[PDB]
Design a protein around this ligand. Structure first.
Ligand SMILES: [Zn+2]
Ligand SMILES: [Zn+2]
Lengths: 689, 240, 579
DNA sequence: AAGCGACTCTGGTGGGACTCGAACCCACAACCTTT
């Protein structure tokens, strides 16, 4: 099952920071590196025959200016820094001069502007339908990044800048009665004012219901700042609150969100793990949203303080077959071991079980990933071992069974600096480096990202047919396995065709028509893009037929909403009569529901024309055809594939696959089409941006 | 590729030397795949607004009017014997529109060839407001500046046009190696011959061109073929 | 800047940092050492089994007698005799100058002073390892796992009244089946107690805790009894080389519970104890470049297991890939133990913050380095180079600031050969370094809070201790049969007229111009150098090398009234605390 | 005067980039080369 996928991705700069590889729900892979964040965007390319992974590459630049954590007045801090560095005590003086938090830049110190950590938001956080990237530098600049156009990442906000000012405005006191304004000239208070705002790691919540998302930032002193962002996130404008909770955990290493549901009651908390070993779930006692609620009291998952640093945390929702109820499985990397804890609400409240699955590695675990759909864990160490670790349900709680996957057999002797798993578990991505060659060191070090197939084509095909999520973009990594097979064998495997026809016959929801359209477009590319010409014409005819079907279903739904809201007698933003004419144009499709709907509409429609005009002419556009409109002067305007209005604006939206086009919403548009314009592309479910 | 992107792509496939307005229309008319619009005078105003409203495009007045482009078509593509010969059939080597003058060691990291890079002046804020509203029509712009109006895409757009979507933006190249890549880019479908690059584009030792070309091969930004030049001697020459 | 000349003949502005370092080191140890640690790890007589003569024979280093040598001492009449001494034997100290020389039977590759609390006035010991064979040489990439002997040598108490007529005594050794030892480190404090401590017959008073970096890839931790307590248990007629087979307190090795997969880490190359109370962490550097930390007290079932013999096996709590090549040397920061430095054969020096191991505080690429010293009062580290990549005439010894002060590297001493080993005296603020040229030098650093570029003539701050020459008379026997070692010793009694005295001219004609010799065994080469960490004997130094001779020197000119002042006040305080 | 801490002034080497010298290769005309 595990075999390499063809393109290795070369990295220009050293891999950098904590747990440096991640794979977003949006199929963008980020590697945090000394001079950038490289982002690898996986495209199920339907326009080319190449069997490789089509990886579009972008990067976030490293900052040009080093970040100073604000601890006082610009002069007050300067005299303090002189005092400590000049101190004749070896301890005070060397503690100041060695710790890079106090010294983010210097005369002979390398600048720490590369990236410490990165976290991907859920989808829908961006101004487009996409996810945001939270990025942390090693000089503690925490920033939120988005790729609004395709080409260039822009910083939306710097959260360290805001939080520094908000601490300064409260004299670094969280409760104003609780502490003095301690003198900055005391090294303990000086260190504290740095420690209280040095971010360790951060994680996004799920989407809270108007949408909202939280971001929890963990600080070295055990404070956590819970940011609340309004969605879509557009900058400082969307920051609805910041609230700091004092965890009290000493030397906190890692953070993750716990979110859980039982009896449709929502609950949530923050799980936090110390570098000194223990793991605890905090109740998030403060939040503004009304639909969620929070855990009542902290629960201790591991108490031992054995100083095995909790390097990573992941958790997955599960349904336990024998307890016959939903439960949450937590897995945490602790040194070379995996700690696991299963959390199960019952009539007793929380029932909790835990263990260490042991003997996995002879070196500490350098990265960990959870297969969200199964709880399959992967774990990795710099000796190049990767171990697949399968949760098996037990009459109470779990057992874990595990196996090594031989990267030696696919890449040879290799070092692995990180792993990530695709959102459906289709691929494992690995940061490979030159390994020890028969006990010799490699002379030259070159980081790469490499991919291996975790699933067979037959399992990817089956899981797409039985897909509960029923959106192709949620499953680009599975349809890429299907794509690879079709391009490799230049035919659609018969069992997939037969099963898909059975689904289209027995269910026929537009997801299966979208899946058919994908297979046929990849088939067309496979056969070199006159029996071959006859076959090309045949399957292109089939593509056009199913492409036409998906169009009718969308047009029917649009008119099936024009009929429901107040009649737009001015015909303001939809070519209603043109669409009615287009639907009535043939008797070939018998669907009475459309034919009566256009009856009711055409009864209600105004006798005034309200035609669409070509802006270069102020002459009518007839609405002859799906894709584009033309006028007597010969201008050609594309039509918005969501609303069929002509995209005459100098900027308009394009699908991720460029298979489809959409208009930008305007203030003249009613709310209901401003919502309609947020639909994914009707042909490929990709963001239309 | 979309029509509006195919415009901005063509502006970015010329180097840092950019385009004149008549050169731009010539580039769109000679494009492959074909440009979707008929490029009528009203359309040229629409496309001009698409440039002026785009924040990455920028506009300059150069000290002197640029020559117009030749018919670039390099190859014979016919034979009287069986088949056809697609060997190079030499046009007149008229004065090059884009002589090589590399922008070395630039502090902003922008790279390419431009003979007037220090001498031309920005007129972006004359052609558009800082709110990106266009201040001039195309006919007003060409009336006021003629061929002295030069259109240049931002470095980020220009470098993207050389590496495509699968290419890695983090890769810096030496200025000489970038200027080789840029000299390829503006040739579109009919790449420069390595013979011609060292003989007359860069005017260097073949060892120098090979050496600086190495990095483009190593990172895989370019593709190598043997090709054939049919001389007026009737004999025909091998070149890369 | 303090004017005038010290009575030892150095300028006061050159000596003034040395005098300051006494107070700074005393103030540190009062705060961050302790009088007792690891109270469970105490020696038991039944864990020390005495080997018979027949059983010890595989372990003893194989040369039964030293090379012939003679020692010439500056300004004395020439001796002219050739000495030769048996394995495990010592010449008598010279009556004026108290240098002692003893022979260990093989090339010395590890060496440390047994640390003793201030004022104790104890007997002073060195623990050392000398390889079994003079000419065999071991690859880095492979585990060795052979036999070897850990040797403990008593030097006497090194009081002024004790030094005339002193001799080194081989008190005992431990026969190890764990290959050669590449590093030795004692627990910095709290390991030693009075030999008169009343303990029940199974127990023995504790001399120290000693960690061994073994060439088979693990660290071994021993608790050492005082010799008299062993000899009281030992039979009276026993063999005079006391060779014991001893159970470890713990074996420290990389791995995990039930993880049968053998670690790639390879040989253990270097050690550092945590400099500060309670010394609970021990670090090691490995051939694969990882730095590995063990939490010595750990009860946790995930780190500690007890073997059937009752010894511990400890797995690490933290490891990280410090270097892309063998990490040859570690130093752990005394002033704040959140920080550590390492250097590896990628020829980078990397400073680490152990709270944040993902990126070093500072990486400086340099020449290939053999050992580091981190003197307590100075923020930077002094580095000994292997010459193979340095520009000719610029190879030597460099002090390098960790980076905040931003000074250029300070070229403390040019050396022609590779400096094999380096030791900084915290008490003296001086540094000593051994060369394949067979020369031992010492150097006084300036106060490195102040910019070194003002040090307009560094040569006034360095002096030779001795140089070994081969005098005619590729393998050991062919070299020994045809050469003898002329040791030339400096008059360390004072540094008057230093730059005109012949040992300095000899050294200065060595520096820069002399050519390295490669058609011989390098029999003169010095491999380890160690200043005493103890306040008693603080002015003493030990060194040894390819000859398997080990030599002790008192740097009388750097011993000082403040050291005497501090020794007596510490004696009084110690005598009040323990009686 | 004698002394000090910047501020220079002087010979020497390496780091990465790049000139260097060589064989290797095209396709043609010359014709030696063959039944
Ligand atoms: Zn028109
Ligand atoms: Zn689409």
């Amino acid at each position: 099952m595990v075999t390499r996928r063809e393109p290795a991705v070369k990295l220009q700069y050293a891999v950098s920071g904590l747990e440096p590889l991640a794979w977003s729900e949006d199929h963008r892979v980020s590697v945090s590196t000394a001079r950038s964040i490289a982002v690898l965007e996986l495209i199920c390319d339907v326009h080319n025959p190449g069997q490789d992974l089509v990886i579009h590459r972008t990067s976030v630049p490293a900052p040009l200016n080093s970040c100073l954590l604000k601890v006082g007045s610009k002069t007050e801090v300067a005299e303090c820094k002189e005092k400590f560095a000049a101190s004749k005590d070896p301890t005070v003086s060397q503690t100041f001069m060695l710790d890079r938090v106090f010294n983010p830049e210097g005369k002979a110190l390398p600048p720490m502007r590369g990236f410490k950590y990165t976290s991907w938001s859920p989808m829908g956080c961006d101004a487009n339908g996409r996810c945001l990237l939270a990025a942390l530098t090693m000089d503690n600049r925490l920033t939120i990044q988005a790729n609004l156009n395709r080409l260039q990442w822009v910083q939306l906000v710097d959260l360290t800048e805001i939080y520094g000012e908000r601490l300064y405005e409260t004299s670094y006191r969280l409760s104003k009665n609780e502490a003095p304004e301690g003198n900055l000239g005391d090294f303990a208070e000086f260190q504290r004012r740095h420690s209280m705002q040095t971010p360790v790691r951060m994680e996004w919540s799920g989407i809270c219901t108007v949408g909202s998302v939280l971001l929890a930032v963990l600080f070295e002193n055990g404070n956590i700042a819970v940011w609340q962002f309004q969605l879509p996130f557009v900058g400082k404008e969307s920051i609805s609150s910041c609230n700091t909770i004092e965890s009290g955990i000493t030397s906190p290493s890692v953070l993750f969100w716990w979110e859980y549901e039982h009896n449709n009651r929502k609950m949530s908390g923050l799980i936090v793990g110390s570098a000194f070993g223990p793991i605890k779930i905090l109740p998030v006692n403060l939040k503004a949203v009304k639909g969620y609620f929070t855990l009542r009291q902290p629960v201790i998952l591991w108490k031992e303080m054995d100083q095995l640093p909790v390097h990573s945390i992941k958790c997955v929702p599960l349904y336990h077959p024998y307890q016959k109820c939903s439960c949450s499985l937590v897995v945490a990397a602790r040194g070379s071991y995996v700690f696991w804890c299963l959390l199960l609400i019952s009539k007793a409240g929380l029932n909790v079980h835990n263990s260490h699955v042991t003997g996995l590695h002879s070196l500490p675990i350098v990265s960990m990933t959870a297969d969200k759909q199964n709880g399959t864990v992967y774990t990795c160490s710099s000796d190049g071992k990767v171990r697949q670790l399968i949760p098996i349900f037990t009459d109470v709680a779990l057992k874990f069974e595990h196996q090594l996957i031989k990267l030696s057999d696919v890449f040879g002797s290799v070092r692995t600096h990180g792993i990530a798993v695709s959102p459906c578990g289709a691929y494992l991505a690995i940061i490979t480096t030159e390994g020890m060659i028969n006990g010799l060191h490699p002379v030259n070090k070159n980081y790469q990202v490499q991919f291996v197939t975790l699933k067979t084509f037959e399992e990817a095909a089956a899981q797409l047919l039985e897909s509960s999520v029923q959106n192709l973009f949620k499953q680009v990594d599975l349809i890429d396995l299907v794509r690879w097979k079709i391009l490799k064998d230049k035919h659609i495997p018969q069992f997939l065709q037969e099963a898909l026809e059975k689904k289209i016959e027995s269910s026929g929801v537009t997801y299966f028509w979208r899946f058919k359209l994908f297979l046929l477009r990849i088939l067309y590319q496979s056969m070199q893009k006159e029996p071959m010409e006859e076959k090309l014409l045949e399957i292109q005819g089939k593509i056009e037929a199913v492409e036409m079907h998906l169009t009718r279903e969308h047009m029917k739904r649009v008119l099936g909403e024009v009929y429901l809201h107040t009649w737009i007698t001015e015909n303001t933003s939809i070519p209603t009569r043109g669409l009615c004419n287009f639907l009535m144009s043939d008797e070939e499709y018998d669907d009475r529901t459309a034919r009566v709907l256009i009856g009711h509409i055409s009864k209600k429609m105004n006798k005034q024309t309200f035609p669409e005009h070509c802006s270069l002419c102020k002459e009518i556009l007839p609405f002859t055809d799906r894709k584009q409109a033309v006028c007597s002067n010969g201008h050609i305007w594309l039509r918005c594939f969501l609303t069929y209005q002509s995209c005459q604006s100098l900027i308009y939206r394009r699908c991720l696959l460029h298979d489809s086009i959409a208009r930008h919403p305007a203030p003249e548009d009613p709310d209901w089409i401003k919502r309609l314009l947020q639909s994914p592309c009707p042909f490929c479910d990709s963001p239309v941006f | 590729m979309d029509a509006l992107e195919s415009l901005l792509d063509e502006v970015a496939l010329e180097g840092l030397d950019g385009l004149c307005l008549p050169a731009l229309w010539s580039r769109l008319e000679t494009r492959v795949p074909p440009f979707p619009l008929p490029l009528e005078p009203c359309t040229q105003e629409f496309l001009w607004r698409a440039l002026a409203t785009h924040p990455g495009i920028s506009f300059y007045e150069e000290p002197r009017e640029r020559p117009d482009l030749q018919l670039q078509d390099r190859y014979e593509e016919i034979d009287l014997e069986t088949g056809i010969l697609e060997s190079r059939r030499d046009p007149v080597a008229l004065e090059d529109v884009y002589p090589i003058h590399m922008i070395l060691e630039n502090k902003d990291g922008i790279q390419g060839s431009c003979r007037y890079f220090k001498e031309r002046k920005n007129i972006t804020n004359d052609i558009r407001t800082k709110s990106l509203q266009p201040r001039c029509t195309m006919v007003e712009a060409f009336d006021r500046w003629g061929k002295k109006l030069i259109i240049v895409a931002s470095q980020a757009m220009r470098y993207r046009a050389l590496i495509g979507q699968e290419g890695d933006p983090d890769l810096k190249l030496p200025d000489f190696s970038y200027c080789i890549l840029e000299r390829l880019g503006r040739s579109r479908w009919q790449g420069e011959l390595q013979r011609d690059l060292h003989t007359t584009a860069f005017k260097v030792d073949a060892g120098k061109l090979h050496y600086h070309r190495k990095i483009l091969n190593k990172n895989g930004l370019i593709t190598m073929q043997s090709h054939v030049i049919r001389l007026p001697t009737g004999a025909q020459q091998h070149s890369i | 800047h303090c004017r005038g000349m010290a009575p030892n003949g150095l300028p006061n502005h050159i000596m003034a940092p040395v005098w300051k370092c006494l107070h700074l080191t005393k103030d540190f140890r009062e705060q961050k050492h302790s009088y007792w640690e690891f109270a469970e790890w105490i020696p038991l007589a039944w864990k020390w089994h005495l080997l018979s003569e027949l059983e010890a024979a595989p372990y003893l280093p194989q040369e039964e007698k030293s090379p012939l040598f003679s020692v010439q001492r500056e300004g004395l009449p020439e001796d002219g005799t050739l000495y030769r001494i048996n394995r495990f034997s010592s010449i008598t100290a010279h009556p004026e100058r108290w240098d002692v020389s003893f022979f260990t039977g093989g090339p010395l590759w590890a060496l440390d002073w047994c640390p003793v609390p201030e004022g104790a006035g104890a007997s002073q010991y060195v623990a050392l390892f000398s390889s079994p064979d003079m000419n065999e040489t071991h690859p880095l990439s492979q585990l060795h796992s052979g036999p070897g002997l850990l040797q403990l040598w008593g030097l006497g108490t090194l009081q002024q009244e004790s030094c005339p007529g002193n001799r080194a005594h081989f008190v005992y050794g431990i026969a190890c089946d764990n290959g050669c030892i590449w590093d030795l480190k004692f627990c910095p404090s709290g390991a030693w107690e009075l030999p008169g401590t009343p303990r029940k017959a199974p127990l023995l008073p504790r001399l120290g805790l000693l960690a061994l970096a073994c060439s088979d890839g693990k660290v071994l931790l021993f608790s050492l009894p005082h010799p008299e307590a062993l000899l009281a248990q030992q039979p009276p007629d026993a063999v005079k080389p006391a060779i014991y087979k001893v159970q470890c307190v713990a074996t420290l090795q990389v791995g995990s519970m039930q993880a049968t997969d053998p670690s790639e880490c390879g040989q253990c190359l270097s050690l550092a104890w945590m400099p500060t109370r309670p010394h609970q962490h021990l670090a090691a550097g490995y051939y694969n470049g990882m730095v590995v930390f063990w939490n010595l007290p750990t009860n946790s079932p995930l780190q500690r297991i007890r073997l059937s013999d009752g010894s511990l096996k400890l797995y690490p709590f933290q490891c990280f890939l410090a270097h892309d090549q063998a990490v040859r040397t570690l130093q752990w920061c005394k002033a704040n133990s959140h920080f550590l430095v390492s250097a590896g054969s990628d020829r980078k020096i990397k400073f680490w913050d152990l709270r944040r191991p993902y990126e070093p505080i500072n990486s400086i690429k340099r020449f290939l380095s053999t050992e580091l010293a981190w003197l307590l009062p100075y923020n930077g580290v002094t580095v000994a180079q292997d010459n193979c990549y340095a520009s000719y005439g610029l190879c030597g010894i460099h002090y390098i600031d960790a980076g905040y002060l931003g000074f250029k590297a300070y070229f403390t001493a040019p050396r022609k050969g590779t400096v094999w080993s380096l030791s900084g005296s915290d008490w003296l603020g001086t540094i000593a370094a051994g060369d394949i040229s067979g020369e031992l030098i010492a150097a006084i650093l300036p106060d490195m809070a102040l910019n070194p570029i003002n040090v307009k003539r560094p040569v006034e701050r360095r002096f030779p201790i001795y140089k070994a020459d081969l005098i005619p008379y590729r393998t050991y026997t062919e070299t020994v049969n045809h050469h003898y070692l002329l040791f030339q010793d400096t008059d360390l009694g004072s540094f008057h007229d230093l730059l005109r005295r012949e040992p300095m001219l000899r050294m200065q004609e060595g520096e820069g111009h002399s050519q390295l010799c490669l058609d011989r065994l390098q029999l003169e080469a010095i491999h380890k150098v160690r200043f005493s960490p103890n306040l008693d004997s603080y002015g003493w130094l030990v060194s040894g090398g390819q000859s398997g001779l080990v030599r002790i020197h008192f740097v009388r000119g750097l011993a000082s009234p403040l050291g005497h002042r501090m020794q007596l006040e510490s004696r009084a305080h110690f005598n009040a605390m323990f009686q």
